[PDB]
Amino acid sequence: PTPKYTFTERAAAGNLSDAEILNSNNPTGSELPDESDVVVGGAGIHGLIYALHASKYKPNNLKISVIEKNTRPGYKIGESTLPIFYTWCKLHGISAAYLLRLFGLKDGLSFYFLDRENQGQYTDFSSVGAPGLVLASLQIERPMSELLFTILAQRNGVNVYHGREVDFKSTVVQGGGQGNKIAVSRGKYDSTPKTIDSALFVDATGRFRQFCSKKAPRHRFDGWNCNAFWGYFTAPKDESKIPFDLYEGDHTNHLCFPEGWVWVIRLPSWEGSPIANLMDMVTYILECADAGVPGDELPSSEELARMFGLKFQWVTSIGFAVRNDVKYPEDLSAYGTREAEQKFNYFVQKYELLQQFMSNFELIENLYGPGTTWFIRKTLAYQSPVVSGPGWLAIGDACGFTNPLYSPGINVGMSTSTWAAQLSHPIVEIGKSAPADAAESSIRKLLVPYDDYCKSLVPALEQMNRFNYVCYRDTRLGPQVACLWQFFAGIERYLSDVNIETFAHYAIKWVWGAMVPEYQQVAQKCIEHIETVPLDERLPDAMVDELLAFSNRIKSAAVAADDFSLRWDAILRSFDRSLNFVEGKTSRDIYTRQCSGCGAWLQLRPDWKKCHSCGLLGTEPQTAVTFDPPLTAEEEALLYAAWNTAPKYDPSKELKLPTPTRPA
Ligand SMILES: Cc1cc2nc3c(=O)[nH]c(=O)nc-3n(C[C@H](O)[C@H](O)[C@H](O)COP(=O)(O)OP(=O)(O)OC[C@H]3O[C@@H](n4cnc5c(N)ncnc54)[C@H](O)[C@@H]3O)c2cc1C
Ligand SMILES: CC1(C)c2[nH]c3cc(Cl)ccc3c2C[C@@]23CN4CCC[C@]4(C[C@@H]12)C(=O)N3
Numbered sequence: 001p002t003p004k005y006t007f008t009e010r011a012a013a014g015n016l017s018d019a020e021i022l023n024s025n026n027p028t029g030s031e032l033p034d035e036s037d038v039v040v041g042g043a044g045i046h047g048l049i050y051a052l053h054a055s056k057y058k059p060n061n062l063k064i065s066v067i068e069k070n071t072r073p074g075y076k077i078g079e080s081t082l083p084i085f086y087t088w089c090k091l092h093g094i095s096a097a098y099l100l101r102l103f104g105l106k107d108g109l110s111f112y113f114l115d116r117e118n119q120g121q122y123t124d125f126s127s128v129g130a131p132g133l134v135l136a137s138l139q140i141e142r143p144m145s146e147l148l149f150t151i152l153a154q155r156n157g158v159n160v161y162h163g164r165e166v167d168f169k170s171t172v173v174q175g176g177g178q179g180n181k182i183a184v185s186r187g188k189y190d191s192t193p194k195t196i197d198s199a200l201f202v203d204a205t206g207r208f209r210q211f212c213s214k215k216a217p218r219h220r221f222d223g224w225n226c227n228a229f230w231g232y233f234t235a236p237k238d239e240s241k242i243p244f245d246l247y248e249g250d251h252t253n254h255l256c257f258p259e260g261w262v263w264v265i266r267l268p269s270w271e272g273s274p275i276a277n278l279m280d281m282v283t284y285i286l287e288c289a290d291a292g293v294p295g296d297e298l299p300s301s302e303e304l305a306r307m308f309g310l311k312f313q314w315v316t317s318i319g320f321a322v323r324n325d326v327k328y329p330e331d332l333s334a335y336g337t338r339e340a341e342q343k344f345n346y347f348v349q350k351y352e353l354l355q356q357f358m359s360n361f362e363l364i365e366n367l368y369g370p371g372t373t374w375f376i377r378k379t380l381a382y383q384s385p386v387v388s389g390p391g392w393l394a395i396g397d398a399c400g401f402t403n404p405l406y407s408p409g410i411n412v413g414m415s416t417s418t419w420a421a422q423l424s425h426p427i428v429e430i431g432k433s434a435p436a437d438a439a440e441s442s443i444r445k446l447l448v449p450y451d452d453y454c455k456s457l458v459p460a461l462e463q464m465n466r467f468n469y470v471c472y473r474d475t476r477l478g479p480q481v482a483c484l485w486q487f488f489a490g491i492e493r494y495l496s497d498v499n500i501e502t503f504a505h506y507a508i509k510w511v512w513g514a515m516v517p518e519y520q521q522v523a524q525k526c527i528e529h530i531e532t533v534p535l536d537e538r539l540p541d542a543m544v545d546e547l548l549a550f551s552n553r554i555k556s557a558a559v560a561a562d563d564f565s566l567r568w569d570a571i572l573r574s575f576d577r578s579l580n581f582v583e584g585k586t587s588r589d590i591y592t593r594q595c596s597g598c599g600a601w602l603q604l605r606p607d608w609k610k611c612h613s614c615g616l617l618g619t620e621p622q623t624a625v626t627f628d629p630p631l632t633a634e635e636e637a638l639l640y641a642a643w644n645t646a647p648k649y650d651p652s653k654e655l656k657l658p659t660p661t662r663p664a
């Protein structure tokens with residue numbers, strides 16, 4: 001495809017604002033429609049996943065308008081994504097060659113557990129992702145993922161309006177498929193709001209819960225909650241002085257300790273780029289995806305930035321997520337002038353390993369505009385007690401949220417967004433095909449499972465969060481109990497069989513494994529023990545021994561009962577094939593390498609000879625995947641064969657679940 005500069009030129013010819021150039025790409029036009037089947041409040045990632053999935057699940061059935069108050073896709077925290085999300089992107093026709101032009105490669109999770117009383121001691125738990133011919137995960141800058149999904153939405157019959165605000169004071173939402181009247185303005189100062197007559201309203205306003213807060217108070221779980229404070233840093237090409245052995249920047253890295261943990265996410269940033277030029281670059285990428293342009297013949301990230309007049313740089317997202325029963329000194333002014341900055345820098349010098357780690361990084365000022373050098377968010381976890389009602393439902397963060405840890409926000413959260421999307425077709429047709437009272441009853445009954453799923457979902461994720469946090473108080477429980485169990489219970493068995501049709505059904509059965517009975521049993525034993533030890537004390541060694549022996553006893557039976565074949569010892573660096581911990585073991589598969597020119601992490605596969613980020617020809621990517629223990633040529637062929645194309649939908653085949661086989 002020859003690149004087009006359609007939006008760049010249109011923006012300049014008409015002197016168009018950011019919201020105007022974006023809204024000019026809408027199928028129905030740059031102004032709001034008088035009527036729609038669905039109106040979605042919010043074009044964060046979940047409002048857009050919802051709109052894309054509803055449209056793709058049954059095209060040309062629902063008219064969908066997404067209303068977003070930001071003038072262009074806005075900054076959001078929440079950058080790490082997981083195989084289920086990549087698979088969703090691939091099912092929606094965007095595979096890794098194209099996604100890697102926009103986003104950072106993620107190919108593993110790694111955990112380093114710092115001993116608080118023996119400064120400088122640590123242990124680790126490391127998993128790899130998958131070969132490049134199998135799948136990828138992604139580290140995403142959220143202004144770019146929300147732009148990608150906006151453009152993709154507009155190319156699939158969905159209208160997305162930036163610069164517009166749902167007015168929840170004058171909006172009317174009513175049941176029975178009768179009629180919503182969604183008031184949309186440019187903000188509070190605007191006294192010519194427009195109304196969209198519509199059948200279904202979707203609350204995708206995230207943690208602000210702008211509609212469902214009207215139906216129930218925010219719910220908080222018992223016990224401590226968490227706070228987060230974070231910033232953006234350079235991303236060193238040379239990672240070798242990082243003080244953790246075998247550290248890799250293409251993992252989501254977790255530095256874990258009694259008070260909480262630090263995330264470390266390497267990702268490219270497009271900040272400073274004009275919105276119109278970005279629309280042209282994204283549109284080009286999608287035309288290239290449509291045409292099947294091979295990776296090596298697709299321009300690199302840096303070449304796209306030259307072609308479309310963009311700004312591109314590598315950054316590291318680094319943040320604390322710590323318990324809110326931490327005691328701070330009253331005066332933290334030695335550490336900075338803002339609270340977020342003060343608590344971040346204070347926590348870094350509490351651990352010699354965090355200070356040594358951070359000394360590989362340089363703070364970026366105001367990456368996302370003035371005031372954004374530092375971020376702080378307090379009291380993270382909450383649940384919405386009501387997530388649907390006559391004329392509406394809620395998805396994503398508007399249902400509830402727990403913690404950054406294991407990235408449930410996007411990757412588990414998209415189970416609500418994609419199930420709501422699928423359900424939206426019969427909800428709208430019911431209202432068009434039955435009188436009001438029966439329509440409303442039928443819709444209510446259809447949504448009982450969705451309501452029930454959301455109700456038990458956040459408590460399960462909250463118990464998952466606490467399980468990990470308490471085990472992070474010790475350098476044996478963290479890796480050998482909490483990480484082991486999250487990986488065993490939550491690995492996505494039979495993900496290669498998922499298709500658009502089964503996606504929501506599969507996703508709601510996953511829950512990161514947090515509903516697996518043996519997982520809950522080990523989690524409750526640890527939480528019950530550890531929560532009785534004040535935060536400022538070390539766990540008694542006998543308590544660690546007892547909890548470790550318990551975990552291992554439950555684990556060995558649950559692993560024996562699982563029927564899913566997996567080369568556990570190639571994925572986890574420190575465990576054998578039966579998921580037993582091995583004190584010295586370092587061996588495992590190698591799926592990635594760093595470009596020697598630009599530092600970007602790359603997937604090893606023989607059809608990608610050039611770095612996808614800077615274009616430098618891998619000297620001769622003789623560097624092939626290393627399987628340890630080895631695979632034959634046939635076994636390798638078989639592996640890649642399973643992941644080529646998702647199977648067609650078979651309404652008679654039953655869905656194989658992601659979770660371990662039950663013991664019978
Ligand atoms: C510190 C931290 C780290 C995290 N890390 C991760 C991670 O690594 N991975 C992960 O998966 N998750 C992570 N999360 C969770 C993640 O940030 C959220 O789950 C996710 O961004 C929520 O998406 P959403 O679409 O529901 O809401 P949002 O992305 O918050 O979007 C809601 C949208 O609604 C809009 N809106 C609000 N009011 C109106 C109105 N009246 N009219 C129109 N529009 C409106 C807002 O402008 C906004 O764009 C993290 C969360 C925190 C706090
Ligand atoms: C199931 C997947 C998505 C997965 N899910 C994880 C969760 C955690 Cl917590 C850690 C690691 C993984 C992995 C690594 C896997 C293991 N599979 C072996 C055959 C194909 C595949 C898919 C992939 C692979 O190549 N790597």
Ligand SMILES: CC1(C)c2[nH]c3cc(Cl)ccc3c2C[C@@]23CN4CCC[C@]4(C[C@@H]12)C(=O)N3
Pocket residue numbers: 419504505508651652653654655
């Ligand atoms: C298993 C069932 C009850 C189910 N349970 C769900 C839970 C969620 Cl969260 C979403 C969708 C479903 C479905 C739809 C299914 C899928 N099955 C395919 C073969 C037979 C069957 C039974 C039925 C079918 O025809 N429709």
Ligand SMILES: [Cl-]
Pocket residue numbers: 080081082109252405406407
């Ligand atoms: Cl993660």
Ligand SMILES: [Zn+2]
Pocket residue numbers: 595596597598599600611612613614615616
């Ligand atoms: Zn490069």
